[PDB]
């Protein structure tokens, strides 16, 4: 169902990818959270995020926000607002987005579903 897609910042992923500017506070849905296999401490999480229009896989959560993952406030289907993030462009042109500050607006249980049918950003 897509009747909640007005809750998400449609177009924010394309804007981050295209322009790389960080002076926005987009509202996104978490699609998945996976640990990066770094082989060392601390755990680090990579997130697949949706803005209702696209998904993007190259988000990394900052270490100070790990307790949100560990205590399940931040989990698949929740809706969150990003308050501070950094864009780092790799040598090959891909962009990693590091989420430094965020707020969970609606828990995974409260949302209950995946919102819309966002298309993977090409990429």
């Amino acid at each position: 169902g897509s009747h909640m897609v007005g809750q998400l910042s449609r177009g924010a992923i394309a804007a981050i990818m295209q322009k790389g500017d960080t002076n926005i506070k987009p509202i996104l849905q978490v699609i998945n959270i996976r640990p990066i296999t770094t082989g060392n401490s601390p755990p680090r999480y990579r997130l697949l995020m949706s803005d209702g229009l696209n998904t993007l896989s190259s988000f990394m959560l900052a270490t100070q926000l790990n307790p949100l993952v560990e205590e399940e406030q931040l989990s698949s289907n929740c809706v969150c607002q990003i308050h501070r993030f950094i864009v780092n462009t790799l040598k090959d042109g891909r962009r990693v987005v590091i989420l430094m500050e965020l707020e969970v607006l609606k828990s995974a249980e409260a949302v209950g579903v995946k919102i819309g049918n966002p298309v993977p950003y090409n990429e």
Binding site: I36, R44, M60, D92, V96
Partner: peptide, 13 residues
């Protein structure tokens, strides 16, 4: 708590 080269490693193709 990471470097640019860490990101390249974690994101390696």
């Amino acid at each position: 708590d990471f470097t640019a080269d860490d990101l390249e490693e974690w994101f390696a193709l």
